[PDB]
Design a protein around this ligand. Structure first.
Ligand SMILES: Nc1ncnc2c1ncn2[C@H]1C[C@H](O)[C@@H](COP(=O)(O)OP(=O)(O)OP(=O)(O)O)O1
Ligand SMILES: Nc1ncnc2c1ncn2[C@H]1C[C@H](O)[C@@H](COP(=O)(O)OP(=O)(O)OP(=O)(O)O)O1
Ligand SMILES: [Mg+2]
Ligand SMILES: [Mg+2]
Lengths: 644, 657
């Protein structure tokens, strides 16, 4: 379209030779300073120059035209390096920089990755697209932290960490439940705590202050609170648009880290006890029956600051969700029961976008490196799915993320310790809805439903095989022995699911039992809000967003063209055949969505950034939606509540 | 009515001092079940070893010496409670405070107990709260410079603030090294948003972290030098009106002003705005050296915006007209006249604008504070007792020197700082009452001499104590190369020759021989609480009003005695604390009891400069103008500046505020 014209113009205004554009980037001198400020690492430039003919000549510049209009503009704004406000890099250079950036001296490996990327089989995360092959690169997306200690020293030490992580272009999930509550005694000053609200206001303004890297994208901290904490009612108010500034912190994000007992008590209309973690230590450090045991003993002991009806807190959760679409809902017990890191102690939160379930502690900060598979690329013109090709590419991605753990420059050393001990990674997807469309399957169709399982079966299987071979080459991760996986327990086992006959799990179990695996966690479906737009696919595991993005969806176009002929259910001309296929996210049952998430969930060792779209959310509809999700086994029952 | 209040407390409290101390220590939290001593084992132990001397040293009648409010303030906050029930009588408190400082030296402890109970001086609230206890943070003031122009150092300095406020310290903070809005950040390849959003983080930290249990909100004073590019926005931060992201209303604000700025305003020249990242080291030089660096950066084109000096000046006045801030400090006077200038450039003052101490990346300066009750030193003869002032100042000097050595510093950079340079801050209250006792109007030439001689005396006293301390213990670490070590005392630095009241020659012989234990001694602080307790006018301020409904004790007395004193009360109240229009009172007493609002501010400034010459730190000098305008405030700031003052204004006070 006009996409062609803009790409042609970029090609006019940039050098075509990849090693030359790389020289210009390393050689760059800042004109206000006169300082040599290379925009690429010398180490990378060296490897490139020693292999230039092969690398320069591997590049297929016609692939630059593969992007659509908004995809190309997005790259142009943010992903392609600028020498003095003027773009130096073509998309293809950027992808080959990233590729050598990850692979270094191994050109064979670098070209494999380059082609996979440039053809759009998968993509790496933005922080990796931005920073790979540059100096002291921070390539990770997700960070998780626990509040260090219930103290001014720990609060401010943890605040310094958020600041530094967020400068380094990372996102944050922070567990704050150990902080003592409004009204609680402080021996050190003979005073009374003001609790979480004003503490969080500091974090709030620290997020407003420290941009994520340097393109004006604002600090992003998700705050996690278990609903047994006394300050919960006020916490559920912090993001509301009205009220007094002292009672608010609207630039943060809010998640609940929810025990089973709470939902239990809500369903049965039982009483709910509110505690201070100082009066009642260690509730965040146990889960399930052990949590239930400790919680109940505390109530029996009178270590309770307020008893409220569970439906009263529930009602406040739902009020907050209707106003703000927040907080996010995580089931603490499902998170911990079905985690391959449970040998490490209780997991205290998820991350910014609700898909990472990794252990944290006062001296470990969870980190995750991310990548997403483009599931549309694996559909044939035959309307079969090429599961062999998916497993195959997945294995390359695992290899890629594993290498990044070792390359990365961590903003705080507790992040480095964490990643080096457990080697977790996070392979996600985008294009799921496109894959259904291309196989001619309505999202809600039983065919959709089988393909849903078999895709994630495939991803996990391939992911495991890759990590297993990495474990033969390099040894398993430090904390492997004692993990569920080290006992032949795999994710689906933990859901008591039996996998279809597509892959031979037996043989893979034997492989792992003999060699073990390199990475404690492998799969984690992230949002893909940037990289999805770049590749031109529906975000993530979301249903079809709409038939428009001033452009009509290319799949609907092609099909409507092949027949010779916003929602499309209103247009009488279009056959009922295609009306089913191209239902929007507003016209799909959310129950179904939760079932499918649970179903793919069995093959996902972390969790999934699962939005729920409801037009006109009410108490009735959210209550059933949440209980259905919890009862279905979800780690994350809801990321955002989306509405019109 | 105050008698009743005291005997009630005496009914509701154990007499014997040693016992009340036992109940404090042996205290168990009814909630916890935890032994949570409200005094420290070593201070209890000392008390019991010496309970006979100490118990019977206490004179419980002295408790009757407080007026109504002073007693109530004590009850509110200074007297320790066992489950919401005051256990301490004011004497128990003052004796605790005395053993808490002097410990096994009971001769010393009693000497200090008497001085305190008779109200010859007072220690600072911090010292009164925590002396003799487990967490004894006895100091009031802390000063800090931002550690580095980096997220690492912004957040490291923030924590320090946090820790310090928690332990009930007030803070002055220098923020000029922080790079300005729009400026390049190499390590992210993006651009800074400058100071405002940074201070929003500080702002909410001060809201969040209280001083003590009192529930006192954290008190941070942010200092900026007016060459910084973000100055107009800085000046808006405290304004009622405006978006929340452009405001930081819980902070306090001072300007750290070079002579150059004031010269360009007066000559109506252009003023250049700079970013410290582009223009490094402006806050690390003062005076000619600053002047030479500022200028050479202008010639180099390292300049982000040029404005008329006067445009910036107008904004400063606007800002003060609404909030009464920022505080006005003259950087060059502060540095030119500091005994700490051997250490390098001083970057800010404190919360209350009276201390001027060196800060650095490894040093957070601290001051321990005490005030002399100047009323006490007037004899029945209507003469001033300068020998008694000196004798008491020596004791105080010694107390604050001991305190340096026993204080719990909340950040190791304070510990380092105080132990290296040993600055103290001796201040005053009851200056207005001393003039009134001597029958001198505030503005009389008689008051002006007394002013000078009072402060001449305090300084001599303080120096002679610190010298004796240096004879005993050695001089302070960094004393050699200081002005005092070259024979240069504060007054030399103002080119003032002292009156003939004291023999400064002899004192310099002594100092030339043994040097001095403390690098700074004197610093009139605001005394908002302790003056209320002691029933004295605040600090160095003129008489604030004739009504507090309690008619001033001195007017009352003076009128009753002459037979001129009921309704008067109402008429003074309806003239807003003034007596200048009451028919019955002689012209005699009208001149004597002029209030702050009827006293020339130029004279006020003149008198501060004149005591100035005998104050090695600075002074919390408020300015009272009922109906400010631009010309009025301008001539006021220029006169103070040209008069050599270190602090030119603390708060602007007016009819409205
Ligand atoms: N001055 C303060 N203002 C507001 N909150 C405070 C203040 N001081 C402490 N807190 C909060 C922070 C923590 O949530 C809790 C304990 O803080 P902390 O620094 O450990 O006090 P502390 O150690 O002197 O007493 P304790 O032994 O009870 O913890 O109280
Ligand atoms: N992410 C950020 N968001 C907003 N301001 C920032 C950010 N990072 C730094 N700043 C501000 C804080 C400091 O005043 C100034 C320098 O920050 P700093 O941590 O030293 O960055 P840097 O070291 O990567 O770059 P440089 O070498 O230019 O100082 O910029
Ligand atoms: Mg503590
Ligand atoms: Mg830096």
């Amino acid at each position: 379209l006009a996409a062609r014209i803009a790409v042609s113009n970029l090609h006019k205004e940039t050098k075509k030779v990849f090693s030359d554009v790389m020289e210009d980037l390393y050689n760059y001198i800042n004109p206000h300073n006169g300082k040599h400020s290379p925009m690429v690492a010398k180490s990378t430039l060296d490897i490139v120059l020693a292999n230039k003919d092969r690398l320069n000549s591997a590049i297929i510049y016609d692939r630059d035209f593969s992007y659509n209009y908004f995809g190309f503009k997005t790259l142009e704004r943010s992903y392609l390096l600028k020498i003095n406000g003027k773009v130096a890099e073509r998309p293809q250079h950027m992808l080959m920089r990233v590729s050598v950036g990850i692979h270094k001296e191994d050109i064979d490996a670098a070209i494999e990755t380059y082609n996979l990327l440039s053809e759009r089989w998968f993509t790496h995360a933005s922080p990796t697209l931005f920073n790979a092959g540059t100096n002291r690169p921070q390539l990770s997306s997700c960070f998780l932290l626990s509040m260090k200690d219930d103290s001014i020293e720990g609060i401010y030490d943890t605040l310094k960490q958020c600041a530094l992580i967020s400068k380094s272009a990372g996102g944050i999930g922070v567990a704050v439940s150990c902080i003592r509550a409004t009204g609680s005694y402080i021996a050190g000053t003979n005073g009374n705590s003001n609790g979480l609200v004003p503490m969080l206001r500091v974090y709030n303004n620290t997020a407003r202050y420290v941009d994520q890297g340097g393109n004006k994208r604002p600090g992003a901290f998700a705050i996690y609170l278990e609903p047994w904490h006394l300050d919960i009612f006020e916490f559920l108010d912090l993001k509301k648009n009205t009220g007094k500034e002292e009672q608010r912190a609207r630039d943060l994000f809010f998640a609940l880290w929810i025990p089973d007992l709470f939902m239990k008590r809500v369903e049965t209309n039982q009483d709910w006890s509110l505690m201070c973690p100082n009066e009642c230590p260690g509730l965040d450090e146990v889960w399930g029956e052990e949590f239930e045991k400790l919680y109940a003993s505390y109530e029996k002991q009178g270590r309770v600051r307020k008893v409220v009806k569970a439906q009263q807190l529930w009602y406040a959760i739902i009020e907050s969700q209707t106003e703000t679409g927040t907080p996010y809902m995580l089931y603490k017990d499902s998170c911990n029961r079905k985690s391959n890191q449970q040998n490490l102690g209780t997991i205290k939160c998820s991350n910014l976008c609700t898909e990472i379930v990794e252990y944290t502690s006062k001296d470990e900060v969870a980190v995750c490196n991310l990548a997403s598979l483009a599931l549309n690329m694996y559909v044939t013109s035959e309307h079969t799915y090429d599961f062999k090709k998916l497993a195959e590419v997945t294995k390359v991605v695992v290899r890629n993320l594993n290498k990044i753990i070792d390359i990365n420059y961590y903003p705080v050393p507790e992040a480095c310790l964490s990643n080096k001990r457990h080697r977790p990674i996070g392979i996600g997807v985008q294009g799921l809805a496109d894959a259904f469309i291309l196989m001619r399957y309505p999202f809600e169709s039983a065919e959709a439903q089988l393909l849903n399982k078999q895709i994630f079966e495939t991803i996990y299987y391939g992911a495991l095989e890759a990590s297993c071979d990495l474990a033969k080459e390099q040894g398993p991760y430090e904390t492997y022995e004692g993990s569920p996986v080290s006992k032949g327990i795999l994710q689906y086992d933990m859901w008591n699911v039996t996998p279809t006959d597509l892959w031979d799990w037996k043989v893979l179990k034997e492989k792992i039992a003999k060699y073990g695996i390199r990475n404690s966690l492998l799969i984690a479906p992230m949002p893909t809000a940037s990289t999805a737009q770049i590749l031109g696919n529906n975000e993530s595991i979301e249903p079809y967003t709409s038939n428009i993005y001033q452009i009509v969806n290319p799949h609907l176009l092609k099909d409507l063209t092949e027949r010779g002929l916003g929602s499309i259910q209103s247009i009488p001309e279009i056959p009922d055949d295609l009306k089913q296929l191209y239902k929007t996210v507003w016209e799909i049952s959310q129950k179904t969505v939760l079932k499918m998430a649970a179903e793919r969930g069995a093959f996902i060792d972390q969790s999934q950034s699962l939005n729920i779209h409801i037009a006109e959310p009410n108490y009735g509809k959210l209550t059933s939606m949440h209980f259905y999700g919890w009862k279905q086994g979800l780690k994350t029952g809801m990321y955002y509540l989306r509405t019109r």
